[PDB]
Structure formats: structure tokens, C-alpha cells
RNA sequence: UGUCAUUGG
DNA sequence: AGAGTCCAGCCAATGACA
DNA sequence: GGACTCT
């Protein structure tokens, strides 16, 4: 149903996007991938980045960034 | 006994060679290459005057290179590596890049 | 078993002597150079005394074939009778036929060879993990029904790891190591 | 050794790539006014655009594809390639 | 990485495609909404992951399932790592 | 040659731990067929493997994964 | 879109 | 002891033909 | 034409 958990949640960033606006680019892609969709039964509804923990290294894959940001993930 | 091998191997990880720094360096450039931000100290419009092989060296030497290698288990950063090793490749790799006419 | 190759397990013999009273020794042919046989042949039960030169330790094995076995223990007997089987079988008292048709110790194709004590398998398990995590590399495979793991057979230490010493054309004597793989 | 003469006709049809970013930015719009480049490649559309005035606006991430220009490396080889020095990396010269 | 660049297709001819990571053929946009219709008609809804893979991998792969083979790819879900400080090493000698 | 208990030709893959795309790169035409009996899941680490997937061989500069480290970039 | 013939390194 | 099965370098270039 | 395998 619906409850609150501390999640990771894995997006890609291009390149172009790992400027000094990049906390922004991180948050429009949590909330265009993540963010109003269904996902194997759980669908989250509003996700809060949470933002006092360390965050971990960006993959790197062929041409862009694969990263796991931390989360505060509402689900329903 | 075994803890003693494993830091005799921690401390070999520390080598560098040709294919890790032409891979940090490949990555950076890369990155750089599609629109990300020089990570050097004293940026400016200037630093967007000279050309981008310079600006790797420099993050390079400053130690604000973003690329972390895996290597044995192990993160590493291109300042983690020997001092000397990576004195000794990137001399070789300027040298070969000035013939080229790029650096 | 004939008279002829009764020589030859008393050189393999001698290996396994040196193995009894040493289980980390280095065992080539230069080991031969530290014995002395003596033969009685017999279609029965033939009798093989490994003298140590220095030592003066005698050593009697009753060799015999794999049908008839009429074995008590002497004095001075090594406590375990040598068979010479038909085929390959499992154990190390067990030498088949194939292995006696030439003399195997003094051949150039012998090989020189060690079981490693504690430290050293823990020195080569150290060096096989790979840094990351719980990995580990294998080492190369060698089966148990081997002349080298009947050689170096102790009844209360499992050999595990079996370390070569390889001839090689430009470095003398390099260091490989093998794991002994288990059979039936 | 280091160098590889290139005939006309290749360095006419072959074209190499000029990223659009901070720093290059002022020469692919100097070479977009002379009309000196050949391709675009829209990444955030993801198109090529051949050019034979259209509007075309540089993000970073897109690129430009120009004539191939001198010291640029080149993989060239002969066959059969048996090992690996039958196909190295050297500079373009006219 | 000149290998990988080579020997796949290029860049310009990128296009989304989604695979199922249950049945493992390509997945299909209906109206705006990818989805896999064998799933969907077997009364499932399970992951569609993005791939970058080759055009005759593609065509290798669904011919493969042509003669029968299902061919089904898992994907890596790393554990977020994170970079920590190491000690200073100096590999010169000590006469 | 000798990297088993026993010597292997190079014509067959008969001890050592080869992929499917490995063999069937090699050549042999029943190798899928025979993955697909006995249910195989194999790792994508070889160069045969690899080159299948798109994906940049273990050898060289590939040997290593890169990723980047974003803290320097979030604390300016 | 594939065969056959001829030729090159 | 004898048949089945698969294997026989790489990269080209022209022309004719179905 | 020739090597490996099942019969
Ligand atoms: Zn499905």
C-alpha cells in the first residue's frame, strides 16, 4: 500500500548536465523517471532527494553517468 | 602471514602504467569533450581560450580530477596512484602529444 | 611385476622413503643420490631395502601383484604393502603397469616437486585473492591418481596444493603450483 | 614514422568531428559562417543533418562534422593483419 | 574503448529500445507506453530496461528465439559505492 | 594447453570454462542449442561476449571501470 | 540479392 | 573396425548472368 | 582430403 521508505534510486545524467546546475538536472531526472509511474506494483508518488548523507560515485557508462541517489521514496 | 601479503598487494595496487592514465585521461576527456565543467582552480572565460588537453593535465596535477579507476578492489583517484609514475607517463604522454601537434 | 620392473619402484621407492621421513622435502632424482637399494625378486612377494647412506635407516617393502597378496608386516617395513595393479587405481601403494614399462625417476620428464607446509599454502591462498571481496583465482588442476600425489602422500596431511619447480630455458627454475582434484 | 600522407580525394569526402562545448564553441560557429561544415548531429533530437541558410542552434552534446584536418590520427593498415603492427594510429599530412 | 567504438553502430543511429528482463525480446510502444505483449498477455507487468546494443545483435537474437531459444539478459544492479581517502604509498627504494 | 588435469587441443573447448558466444564465435553451430538444453547462465566477461553486447572488453584501458566523483562538482 | 569467370596485394 | 559431420587465410577489383 | 565421434 502505501508507507515511506529510504531508497536508492538510479538515473542517468548526460555529460552536458554536470555543470554547477547539477543537484536541478539530478531532481528533474528522479522526478521525470521516478516520480508519477508504476513500477512492479509500488508506485511512488512524491520523492524528496535526501541530502545529508554522502553521495556515491557516478558509473560511468558509453557516452553518460549512471547514478544512485539517495532518497526519501513515499510509496502507494 | 596473509595480512602482510594483502598490504604487499595493497601497495602494488599504487603502480601505474600506460593503460590506467590513458584510461583517466580518456574518461576526463570524454566528459569534457560533451559539456562538462573544468574542475580547475582560477576559472574564467580564459580558461576557455586554451585548449582542453592542457585543462586535463591541470586537473590532473591539481588533484580535482573527477575520474576514480577501480582497480583491485580498490577506488582510486590519479593522485592516489605513485607521484613518480605519474610524472613518468604523463612526461612520455606530453612529449608524444607535442609531436602530434595537439598539447 | 618382473624383474625388470622391480628397479624402477625401488627408485620410486626411495622417493617415497625420503617422503616418510621428511613430508616437506624437494623430491627429483638428486634425492637418489641419498639411498641404496637392494632387490629380492620373487613372483610371489618381491622385497625392496631402502638403505638412508648417512642415517643408516633400513626401509623393507613388500612389493606384490594385485591377485595374490600375502602380506605381514616385517621388521623395518615400511607398514603398508606396494600393489602393482593392472590399470590406474586410487591409492598411493597402488602403481599400475604403465608406470613401470620405463625408468620414470631418472627420466628428464621427472618432475621436481614440493607439498607445501602451512605458511606457504597460506602465502599462495593470500596471493590467489583477488582484492575484491571474497574472490579468489584457481590454481591450475592435477588429478589424484597421479605418481607425484602417490609420492607425496602423508596419512594425516591432505594434500591440497602440489608446487613444481619447472625447468626454464632462460630463468633456471620457475615456480608453478598445482591443486590435487579428487577422483571416485 | 609518426606521419601518414593522405591523397586529396580522402581528406575531400572524409570529415571528422568538432564537439560543441565551452571551448569550441566559437570555432564551429566561425566554421557554420564560412560554411566549412558538412554534418550536424542534434544529440537532444537525436538527428544528423546534412548541410548542402537553415537555423541550427548549438548545445553542448551536439556536434559538427568538418573536412578531416592535418595531424589528425588516422587508423591505417595493410593486409593481412597478422600482428599488431600492421595497424597503427599516425597523423594525417597533405 | 576505439574496439567498442568501432565495431558497434554508430551514434547517429541511436534509438530507445526497451527489453523485458523476464522474456527477454524487444519491448513495444502501444500509444506513448512501453509494454511487452507476451507479458501483458500472460497476466504480468515485469521490468523493461534500456539497451545499447547493435542492430544485428538484435536481429541475431530474435532469430535465435525464431528457432526456439529463449535468450533472456539480466542486468547489474550495483551497490552505490563510495570513494574514501587512502594513505600515501612511495614505491622508491630505500638505499 | 595443460591448464586442466589433462591436455586440450585448440580445436574444442572441452575443460575450460568457455561462454556460448565464446564458442559459437569460435565456431560451433550447435552451442546455443546446447545452452538452451542444459538452461546455461553465463557472465558476460570474454571478448567474444563482449563484442555481442556492445560492450568494451576487459582488455587494456577497459580493464578498469571509471566513475566520477561528483563531491568536488556539489561543493561548488 | 546471390552464383560463375578473370585478376590484384 | 566403418560411416557422419564439419572444416578448409584475409581484404579486394571488374564483367556476365539468373 | 582429413580428424573426432558413435556405432
Ligand atoms: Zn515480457
Redesign the pocket.
Same mark, same amino acid.
Given at each position: 500500500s502505501s508507507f515511506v521508505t529510504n531508497g536508492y534510486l538510479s538515473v542517468t545524467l548526460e555529460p552536458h548536465e554536470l555543470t554547477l546546475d547539477i543537484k536541478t538536472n539530478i531532481r528533474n531526472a528522479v522526478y521525470k523517471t521516478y516520480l508519477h509511474r508504476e513500477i512492479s506494483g509500488k508506485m511512488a508518488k512524491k520523492i524528496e532527494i535526501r541530502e545529508d548523507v554522502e553521495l556515491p560515485l557516478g558509473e560511468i557508462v558509453n557516452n553518460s553517468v549512471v547514478i544512485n541517489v539517495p532518497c526519501v521514496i513515499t510509496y502507494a | 602471514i596473509g595480512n602482510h601479503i594483502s598490504a604487499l598487494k595493497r601497495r602494488y595496487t599504487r603502480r601505474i602504467s600506460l593503460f590506467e592514465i590513458a584510461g583517466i585521461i580518456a574518461e576526463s576527456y570524454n566528459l569534457l569533450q560533451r559539456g562538462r565543467l573544468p574542475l580547475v582552480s582560477e576559472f574564467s572565460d580564459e580558461t576557455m581560450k586554451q585548449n582542453m588537453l592542457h585543462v586535463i593535465i591541470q586537473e590532473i596535477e591539481e588533484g580535482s580530477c573527477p575520474i576514480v579507476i577501480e582497480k583491485n578492489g580498490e577506488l582510486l583517484s590519479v593522485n592516489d596512484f605513485d607521484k613518480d609514475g605519474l610524472k613518468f607517463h604523463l612526461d612520455y604522454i606530453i612529449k608524444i602529444w607535442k609531436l602530434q601537434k595537439r598539447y | 611385476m618382473n624383474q625388470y620392473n622391480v628397479k624402477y619402484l625401488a627408485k620410486i621407492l626411495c622417493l617415497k622413503t625420503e617422503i616418510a621421513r621428511d613430508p616437506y622435502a624437494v623430491i627429483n632424482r638428486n634425492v637418489l643420490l641419498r639411498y641404496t637399494t637392494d632387490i629380492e625378486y620373487n613372483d610371489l612377494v618381491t622385497l625392496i631395502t631402502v638403505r638412508h647412506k648417512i642415517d643408516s635407516m633400513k626401509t623393507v617393502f613388500q612389493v606384490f601383484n594385485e591377485s595374490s597378496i600375502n602380506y605381514t608386516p616385517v621388521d623395518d617395513d615400511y607398514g603398508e604393502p606396494i600393489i602393482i595393479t593392472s590399470y590406474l587405481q586410487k591409492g598411493h601403494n597402488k602403481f599400475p603397469v604403465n608406470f613401470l614399462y620405463i625408468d620414470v625417476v631418472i627420466s628428464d620428464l621427472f618432475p621436481s616437486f614440493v607439498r607445501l607446509d602451512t605458511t606457504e599454502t597460506n602465502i599462495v591462498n593470500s596471493v590467489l585473492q583477488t582484492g575484491d571481496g571474497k574472490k579468489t583465482l584457481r590454481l591450475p588442476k592435477m588429478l589424484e591418481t597421479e605418481i607425484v600425489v602417490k609420492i607425496l602422500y602423508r596419512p594425516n596431511i591432505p594434500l591440497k596444493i602440489v608446487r613444481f619447480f619447472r625447468n626454464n630455458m632462460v630463468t633456471g627454475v620457475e615456480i608453478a603450483d598445482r591443486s590435487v582434484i579428487s577422483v571416485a | 614514422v609518426n606521419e601518414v600522407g593522405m591523397p586529396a580525394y580522402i581528406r575531400n569526402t572524409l570529415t571528422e568531428k568538432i564537439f560543441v562545448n565551452a571551448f569550441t564553441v566559437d570555432k564551429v560557429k566561425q566554421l557554420l559562417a564560412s560554411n566549412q561544415v558538412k554534418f550536424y548531429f542534434n544529440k537532444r533530437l537525436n538527428q544528423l543533418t546534412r548541410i548542402r541558410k537553415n537555423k541550427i542552434h548549438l548545445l553542448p552534446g551536439d556536434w559538427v562534422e568538418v573536412a578531416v584536418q592535418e595531424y589528425t590520427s588516422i587508423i591505417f593498415g595493410?593486409?593481412?593483419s597478422l600482428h599488431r603492427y600492421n595497424v597503427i594510429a599516425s597523423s594525417i599530412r597533405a | 574503448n576505439t574496439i567498442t567504438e568501432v565495431l558497434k553502430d554508430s551514434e547517429e543511429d541511436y534509438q530507445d529500445v526497451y527489453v523485458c528482463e523476464n522474456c527477454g525480446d524487444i519491448a513495444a510502444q502501444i500509444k506513448g507506453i512501453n509494454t511487452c505483449l507476451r507479458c501483458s498477455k500472460l497476466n504480468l507487468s515485469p521490468l523493461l530496461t534500456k539497451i545499447d546494443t547493435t542492430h544485428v545483435s538484435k536481429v541475431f537474437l530474435t532469430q535465435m528465439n525464431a528457432r526456439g531459444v529463449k535468450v533472456k539478459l539480466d542486468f547489474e544492479r550495483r551497490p552505490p559505492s563510495f570513494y574514501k581517502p587512502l594513505d600515501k604509498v612511495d614505491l622508491k627504494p630505500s638505499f | 594447453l595443460c591448464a586442466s588435469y589433462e591436455p586440450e587441443?585448440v &580445436? !574444442?573447448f572441452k575443460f575450460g570454462a568457455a561462454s556460448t558466444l565464446k564458442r559459437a564465435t569460435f565456431?560451433? &553451430? !550447435?552451442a546455443l542449442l546446447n545452452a538452451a538444453l542444459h538452461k546455461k547462465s553465463e557472465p558476460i566477461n570474454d571478448n567474444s561476449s563482449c563484442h555481442f553486447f556492445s560492450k568494451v572488453p576487459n582488455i587494456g584501458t577497459g580493464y578498469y571501470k571509471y566513475f566520477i566523483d561528483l563531491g568536488l562538482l556539489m561543493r561548488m
Amino acid at each position: 500500500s502505501s508507507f515511506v521508505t529510504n531508497g536508492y534510486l538510479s538515473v542517468t545524467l548526460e555529460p552536458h548536465e554536470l555543470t554547477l546546475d547539477i543537484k536541478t538536472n539530478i531532481r528533474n531526472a528522479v522526478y521525470k523517471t521516478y516520480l508519477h509511474r508504476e513500477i512492479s506494483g509500488k508506485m511512488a508518488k512524491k520523492i524528496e532527494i535526501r541530502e545529508d548523507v554522502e553521495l556515491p560515485l557516478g558509473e560511468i557508462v558509453n557516452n553518460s553517468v549512471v547514478i544512485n541517489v539517495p532518497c526519501v521514496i513515499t510509496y502507494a | 602471514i596473509g595480512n602482510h601479503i594483502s598490504a604487499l598487494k595493497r601497495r602494488y595496487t599504487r603502480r601505474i602504467s600506460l593503460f590506467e592514465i590513458a584510461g583517466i585521461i580518456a574518461e576526463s576527456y570524454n566528459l569534457l569533450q560533451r559539456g562538462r565543467l573544468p574542475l580547475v582552480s582560477e576559472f574564467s572565460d580564459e580558461t576557455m581560450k586554451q585548449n582542453m588537453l592542457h585543462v586535463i593535465i591541470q586537473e590532473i596535477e591539481e588533484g580535482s580530477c573527477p575520474i576514480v579507476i577501480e582497480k583491485n578492489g580498490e577506488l582510486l583517484s590519479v593522485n592516489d596512484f605513485d607521484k613518480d609514475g605519474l610524472k613518468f607517463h604523463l612526461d612520455y604522454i606530453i612529449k608524444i602529444w607535442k609531436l602530434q601537434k595537439r598539447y | 611385476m618382473n624383474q625388470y620392473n622391480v628397479k624402477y619402484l625401488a627408485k620410486i621407492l626411495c622417493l617415497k622413503t625420503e617422503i616418510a621421513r621428511d613430508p616437506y622435502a624437494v623430491i627429483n632424482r638428486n634425492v637418489l643420490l641419498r639411498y641404496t637399494t637392494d632387490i629380492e625378486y620373487n613372483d610371489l612377494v618381491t622385497l625392496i631395502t631402502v638403505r638412508h647412506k648417512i642415517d643408516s635407516m633400513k626401509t623393507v617393502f613388500q612389493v606384490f601383484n594385485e591377485s595374490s597378496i600375502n602380506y605381514t608386516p616385517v621388521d623395518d617395513d615400511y607398514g603398508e604393502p606396494i600393489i602393482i595393479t593392472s590399470y590406474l587405481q586410487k591409492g598411493h601403494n597402488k602403481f599400475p603397469v604403465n608406470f613401470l614399462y620405463i625408468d620414470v625417476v631418472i627420466s628428464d620428464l621427472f618432475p621436481s616437486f614440493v607439498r607445501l607446509d602451512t605458511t606457504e599454502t597460506n602465502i599462495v591462498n593470500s596471493v590467489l585473492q583477488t582484492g575484491d571481496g571474497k574472490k579468489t583465482l584457481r590454481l591450475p588442476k592435477m588429478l589424484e591418481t597421479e605418481i607425484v600425489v602417490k609420492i607425496l602422500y602423508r596419512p594425516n596431511i591432505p594434500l591440497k596444493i602440489v608446487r613444481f619447480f619447472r625447468n626454464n630455458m632462460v630463468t633456471g627454475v620457475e615456480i608453478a603450483d598445482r591443486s590435487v582434484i579428487s577422483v571416485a | 614514422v609518426n606521419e601518414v600522407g593522405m591523397p586529396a580525394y580522402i581528406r575531400n569526402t572524409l570529415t571528422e568531428k568538432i564537439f560543441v562545448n565551452a571551448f569550441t564553441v566559437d570555432k564551429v560557429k566561425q566554421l557554420l559562417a564560412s560554411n566549412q561544415v558538412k554534418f550536424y548531429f542534434n544529440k537532444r533530437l537525436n538527428q544528423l543533418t546534412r548541410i548542402r541558410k537553415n537555423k541550427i542552434h548549438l548545445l553542448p552534446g551536439d556536434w559538427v562534422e568538418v573536412a578531416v584536418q592535418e595531424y589528425t590520427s588516422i587508423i591505417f593498415g595493410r593486409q593481412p593483419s597478422l600482428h599488431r603492427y600492421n595497424v597503427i594510429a599516425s597523423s594525417i599530412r597533405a | 574503448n576505439t574496439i567498442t567504438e568501432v565495431l558497434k553502430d554508430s551514434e547517429e543511429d541511436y534509438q530507445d529500445v526497451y527489453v523485458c528482463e523476464n522474456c527477454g525480446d524487444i519491448a513495444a510502444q502501444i500509444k506513448g507506453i512501453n509494454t511487452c505483449l507476451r507479458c501483458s498477455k500472460l497476466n504480468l507487468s515485469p521490468l523493461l530496461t534500456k539497451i545499447d546494443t547493435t542492430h544485428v545483435s538484435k536481429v541475431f537474437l530474435t532469430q535465435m528465439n525464431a528457432r526456439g531459444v529463449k535468450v533472456k539478459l539480466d542486468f547489474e544492479r550495483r551497490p552505490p559505492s563510495f570513494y574514501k581517502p587512502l594513505d600515501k604509498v612511495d614505491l622508491k627504494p630505500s638505499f | 594447453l595443460c591448464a586442466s588435469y589433462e591436455p586440450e587441443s585448440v &580445436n !574444442k573447448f572441452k575443460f575450460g570454462a568457455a561462454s556460448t558466444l565464446k564458442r559459437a564465435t569460435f565456431g560451433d &553451430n !550447435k552451442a546455443l542449442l546446447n545452452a538452451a538444453l542444459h538452461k546455461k547462465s553465463e557472465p558476460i566477461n570474454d571478448n567474444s561476449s563482449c563484442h555481442f553486447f556492445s560492450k568494451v572488453p576487459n582488455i587494456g584501458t577497459g580493464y578498469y571501470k571509471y566513475f566520477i566523483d561528483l563531491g568536488l562538482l556539489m561543493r561548488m
